[PDB]
Amino acid sequence: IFHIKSRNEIGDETVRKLYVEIMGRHSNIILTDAAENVIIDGLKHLSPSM
RNA sequence: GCUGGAAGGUUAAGAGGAGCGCUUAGCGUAAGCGAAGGUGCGAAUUGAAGCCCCAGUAAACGGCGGCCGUCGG
Structure with a gap:
């Protein structure tokens, strides 16, 4: 887990997860929007x- | 289409009657101005129904799709 807060370009403290399912061969870096738990890429x- | 609303726009004829002309006394050296009256044109403002507009209605009119993927978009 990586608790990415962001004092982003606004000033609001937009928090999200960045789950990385480190699984060797087929891993996946996933920016999971924490408050919604939705993939964004x-x-x-x-x-x-x- | 109908039914309803319809705040508001726009819309008549009509009431209008601001003003605009012309006639012409009189004033006028001329130039022209010109009062009144007449006569003609007349704007402003008002002016419903209506349509513009918003609803509802399919045993009303009427209408009942395409493209991509492998049933979904």
């Missing part, structure tokens, strides 16, 4: 096409 898919 991720790496590996499973659409769930299967």
